[PDB]
Amino acid sequence: RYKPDWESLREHTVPKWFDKAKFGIFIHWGIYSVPGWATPTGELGKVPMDAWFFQNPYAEWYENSLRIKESPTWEYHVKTYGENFEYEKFADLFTAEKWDPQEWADLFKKAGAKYVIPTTKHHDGFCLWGTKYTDFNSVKRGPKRDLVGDLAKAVREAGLRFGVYYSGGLDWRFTTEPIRYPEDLSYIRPNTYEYADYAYKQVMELVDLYLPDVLWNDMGWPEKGKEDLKYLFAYYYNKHPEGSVNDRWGVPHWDFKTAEYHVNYPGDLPGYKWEFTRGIGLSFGYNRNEGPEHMLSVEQLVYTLVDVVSKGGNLLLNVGPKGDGTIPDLQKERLLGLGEWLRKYGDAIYGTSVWERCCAKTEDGTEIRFTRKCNRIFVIFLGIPTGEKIVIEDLNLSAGTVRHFLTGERLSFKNVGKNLEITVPKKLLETDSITLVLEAV
Amino acid sequence: RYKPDWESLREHTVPKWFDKAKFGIFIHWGIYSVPGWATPTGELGKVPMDAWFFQNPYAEWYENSLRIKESPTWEYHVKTYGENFEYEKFADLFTAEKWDPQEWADLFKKAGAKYVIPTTKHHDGFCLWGTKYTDFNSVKRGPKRDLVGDLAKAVREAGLRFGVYYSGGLDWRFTTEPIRYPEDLSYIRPNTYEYADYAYKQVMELVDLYLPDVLWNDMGWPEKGKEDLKYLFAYYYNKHPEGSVNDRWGVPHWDFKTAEYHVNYPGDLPGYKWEFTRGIGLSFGYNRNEGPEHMLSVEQLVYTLVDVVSKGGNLLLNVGPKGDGTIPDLQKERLLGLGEWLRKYGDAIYGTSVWERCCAKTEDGTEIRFTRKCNRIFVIFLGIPTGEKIVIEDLNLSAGTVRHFLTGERLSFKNVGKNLEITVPKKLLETDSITLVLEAV
Amino acid sequence: RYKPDWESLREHTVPKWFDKAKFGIFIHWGIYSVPGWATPTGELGKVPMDAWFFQNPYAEWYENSLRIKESPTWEYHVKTYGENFEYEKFADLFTAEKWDPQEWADLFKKAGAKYVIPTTKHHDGFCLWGTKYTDFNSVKRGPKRDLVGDLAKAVREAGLRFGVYYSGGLDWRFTTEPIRYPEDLSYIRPNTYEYADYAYKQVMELVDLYLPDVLWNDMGWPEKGKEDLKYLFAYYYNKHPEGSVNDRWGVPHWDFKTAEYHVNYPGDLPGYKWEFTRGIGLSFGYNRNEGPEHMLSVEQLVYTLVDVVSKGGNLLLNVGPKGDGTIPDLQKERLLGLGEWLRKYGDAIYGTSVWERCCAKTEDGTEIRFTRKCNRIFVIFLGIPTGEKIVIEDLNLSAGTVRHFLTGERLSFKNVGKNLEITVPKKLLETDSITLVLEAV
Amino acid sequence: RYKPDWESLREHTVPKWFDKAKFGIFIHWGIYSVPGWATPTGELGKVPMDAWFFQNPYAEWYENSLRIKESPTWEYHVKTYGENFEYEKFADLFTAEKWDPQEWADLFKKAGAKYVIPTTKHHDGFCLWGTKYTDFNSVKRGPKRDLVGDLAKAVREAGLRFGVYYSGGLDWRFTTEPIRYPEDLSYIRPNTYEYADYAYKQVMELVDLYLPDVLWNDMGWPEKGKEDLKYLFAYYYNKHPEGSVNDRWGVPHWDFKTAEYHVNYPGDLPGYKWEFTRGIGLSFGYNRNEGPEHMLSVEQLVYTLVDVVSKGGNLLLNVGPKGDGTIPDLQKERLLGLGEWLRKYGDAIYGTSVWERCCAKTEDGTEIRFTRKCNRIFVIFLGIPTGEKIVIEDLNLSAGTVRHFLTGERLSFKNVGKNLEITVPKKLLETDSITLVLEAV
């Protein structure tokens, strides 16, 4: 058994299934999906933090932006919904009338994802399950439905792993003042013993009702409640050894680390398992203001996934549904495009390990990423070279046999100085889709 | 911004407005005002503590006295209200039917006060505002009115600062046993995590609804809740830099210290800002048993204010209203008398600083106090000398010019040995009211 | 860079070299090696603990035993050396006259060990390096030599890893009373801040002088110094990322766990990296009283090694040299025997991983262990069966090819029900040494 | 009496003498003054921190730099003094052969400084007084003299205040590894209880032997000794109420805050007392590599002083003497230049307070700073305008009288819109030295 102390909990390491999964789907869905609006300012890590909360690109932070008067959100809300329409009132408009969880589960499976993590409770404190610790939840208001539960059944039916996102660090149902500057986060928090118990009780309830594969907390865990985690993590691991927790609790234990947009993104192999998360656009929650110009293209999603994976992480790509339970076409098309590349190149991604190095580039700048499966080394070009002669800078191979991944064709190569030169017939280059993939043995 | 740690909060010092205000009005008003009764035994610091709680002069401690059977209060209650009339039941008789907050605000302004602090919640735990954390409050019972709110508007309308008194340390809604000896205070306290959250939540709510100029806590802050103060004080100071807190929280920070009757009263300059508090009589809450013999006279209020001020403090003088919202004539007349002296001598009090020394006396025992305004030194006699020749013991002046404050008349003086001799024409002595005031430059 | 906090230090996991090494050599050597005497009572975990300290089989515990009057050690010592003969005096008799560090390293490399960990300081507080925090060390006393540094240089020149053992939890130079019962360990420890500093300073010193590959602490870390380990570990990992620490510090962090004789020995796959340690006999320090009846035979060492590796562990086999620095023949022969077995079967041990299960057994009781290297599964029998027909219980293989490891010869097999049947030609069974080994692909 | 608790110690505020003094002299002098060498890379706050320790402009950090092999210091040292030349050896070469404490004090009083604070012990752990806790001090080594005591006696005889600087947070006599990156500061510290005692004992010793006016700690206080400061501070204030402490202890209490070069420099009125410190050049310790290109000119010192004072701070200007105890001419000339300016404009600096605003500027870009003394407002231009017509932006005065400070001559002025227009006769503008100064009443 695991014991409730960090030294014992340290015995639990990231489960094998998570390490091999590589790709998961995040879902930021809640009453903020109804107004579904934000100023698409930029990417976290690139937007100056002196402005960020005033021009917040995260549509799920709508309530916080609403509280800052004369924030673009406040202007939009007053003209659209009125000055007398409290944020909470969106719970009545959040109906999920067109929601079909098996349809989501199928799209995620078709997209190539192996696990799904919905927001059970984001910062606004609204719970997407029939929690018994608050009436501000989807069973008592809005959908009159247990979204977390119904989605967990659908996802598991599709054979995917199901995890839960919980906002332990923030709950605007316990504060009145908005966050305007990063500094405010140091003191505008629930702060009470009451809140530390609520958060513990709610995650315990998520463990009891759905036994999730991942406990993905956000924004730290209330200080007064930190010692509780030893007990919660043991309780969880004893019911579900293959369960896993992220690194946003602020305590000694975690099974995998996280990076969000530019924030904490590794430049090379990090030495521990991690997971990169971002939305398809600049928001997590649905933003009606984003168009294709604010979103990654299929190509960029593939290069992204490849880079993350060659560095040992998983890609946790966020989908932001509308209040009605539908997934916007722009998102769906990107997911399906990724799923297509994965159906074709999945073997060089899933179940792979990192190699000695993650990266290389060709003489004319095409980036290259590596992954491994025992003796097999996959060479994944972020792009398809135009000519047949390829020169990879700073790489030698002692394999004696390099093949073209898709066809299996054995190819001609040789170590030329500090480089590796290979000839790939144009007929093969023409068969690859977004990436030229080679396999060295 | 202020950060939630004592080292950062230390940057906040007493606001300039508070330091210059000199005089404020305390208001102990609540359901204890209805029975409005106590044995006027004596002054805190003079009554032996082995008897104090059994013959409590603080009428606001009525409930605690009621719980000690065979306490004079218990005898009075049973004969007047009956053995079956619970203390809580007074909330139904507390109607404030004759209450006029603008009338109070005007009396306080006329009295010369610059800030007003009502009891939002005293030890009996009854809240004079529509708090959402208890139904034992003035909006749900008694007046069916938000007294703190309506009084805050009235006081601000009169141009005075508004602060709030909160009993963080005691709440008899969380205990059953009475305090009989000082020792009991060490353990008869709410004690729960629940109470530490309630107190934090209620002061946060007072900050949110009324943004007070002073947070005047009493009886210490619950131990389990002490770390919360770093967050509460930062939250408060960031919303209201010019806000201020007293020294009864039991934590590193405070903006000004307090003395109550004889307790902690400085004998000379203390080196930090402080505030002296007391009722006009021996109680804070209305005591129908006090007559003029238990109250300070206008003269004694003036000497009091002068002494406090010459030592760097403010006088926080308590008014105890009746259950109907009226202020007893004996109190009102003393307030107005003080206001009259202040209209005349205000310039030697308001906005002043301490001098090198606070005190001196005349050859025949008249006490003298000093205050300052840059180069101007005010010499305030606690009384009006009979003869024209005045000899101040142990004082020399290097001003070359001493005037009679009221008229401006230049007077004749000279340093005679270790003394200062001055001649004040009887026509001038006859114009002064309760104090001879001289001005040296 | 690792930061000095548990959450950050958790980013460091057991290094690859340690995971792949499988076999290392422990060396308990010090002044207790001079008397080299204990009553070989039995194995830790089997001998009742109410008798253990009184008849301690760990010869390195001689001083503690000596402190227990009329314990077999007391009597032996008084009869051999006399009552006017303090334990410390052995420091002067510890001359290591015949020590040859390169011979030790040649021997351990021949035995098949990939790392060596000598006792730099055992419970008696005698230090084997020229420490500057105590004069009770090998440079000042006895050998007049830096034993730790000289062995480190030889071990590393032989191509092996070098770690250090340090008794952080016990130091008899700071106590006077012996440990008589397990409970005594809870209060009879140095206990002072002075000792906490000393232990911190000496491990830091080992790190700065030798930068070891393993920091092997024993008996917990002084409670007063536990917070220091956050800094010590970050400082160490920042200078040597491939460095490692065991799990006897009593803090949140460790890279691998440990089991001693029967204590904490896993019966199955534990799920984290660990290391098994024990003496070739029943003691760690040299014991002239042990005969071959008290030691493991080469066959049992092989079986011990295999069991350990199949379960994900490393064997840290202890060698106990004499005071003159020679390794007793009984131990050298067993080391060589194991080295020989490893020279034949090494490929199925070094660099392997655990399989789905660690263990099986034939229909006739022969135990089997499994190890893995990608698609290759090693089937290691703990013995060599007599008949060519072998029936393994409760096992089915989906390999389609099962070879005899040493010869590489393809073997006939089929899954018969819930069993696996293999025919091993007598010629092949005769080729194997202590273990029949098969390889499935 | 102050009690040893933060709430009580908070009763002590910055003393009047320190608030009124405005200008003091810092002295970084020790054995590092002998090599007196650094690469004058730039100012702290501008030089990237990933290069700063490798090209440290603080010559007093010589030992740390020397510990970084092939850092410009390492190379310089090996070429000048050799590889067989330990840093400690400079202690013997530090002879202060030409030191004359009264000459130093005469110089600082001429410069206009009101207090002097020498380094009693910098990061290298060398002590400049006959401490009894270490032999690595000036009485036993090099000068054979109590530098701290002798300078204290001379400074005080010159009529100035005397404080002491102590490196509580760093002492390289307890570490071996150099600081290479800012992060290293989080774990490379003495860390022991022994060090916490030593630091406590030495500051106590400074207090008992010299009763300094300022306790200037640097680099935080050892975590294990932070609770000791409650006692140290009470003990100190009880012996010397006018004593003071800076804000580099990392505990709740401090009397004034600090800013170093660009680090923590306020752009406006901070609201608490503070002190700015920096070298005349880019180093604190003497650096023979600095020329006048690396130093502030007399004009910039004046401007620095004014900016600081207008914002409520004091300037603690650092002087870096040579190993022989003489102050380099480049520094002595700038000290004298500033002293001259202070002899003319002192009345607008010493004893002043901040005004409503610290700053303004003319229509043509000349910066202006304000200071106050009761009803007098000093308008200090950072330069001397060329034209007699001066237009100050965004300022209106209700004084009715504006004089030219040096001559006292009444000037013509009027508020023109949102500006202030003054005519300063060319004769007067020519009388001023580095700053045009006006006085409004």
Ligand SMILES: C[C@@H]1N[C@H](CN)[C@@H](O)[C@H](O)[C@@H]1O
């Ligand atoms: C995955 C993202 N995490 C951030 C907190 N860093 C959230 O604020 C954001 O809304 C989203 O949930």
Ligand SMILES: C[C@@H]1N[C@H](CN)[C@@H](O)[C@H](O)[C@@H]1O
């Ligand atoms: C101002 C006074 N403070 C005391 C606590 N010392 C209270 O017990 C009393 O009722 C009144 O509120």
Ligand SMILES: C[C@@H]1N[C@H](CN)[C@@H](O)[C@H](O)[C@@H]1O
């Ligand atoms: C490896 C062994 N560890 C035990 C501590 N349980 C020691 O008591 C013993 O001396 C030996 O060092």
Ligand SMILES: C[C@@H]1N[C@H](CN)[C@@H](O)[C@H](O)[C@@H]1O
């Ligand atoms: C005044 C300056 N303080 C810094 C510490 N930040 C020191 O590193 C430097 O040597 C000098 O003493």
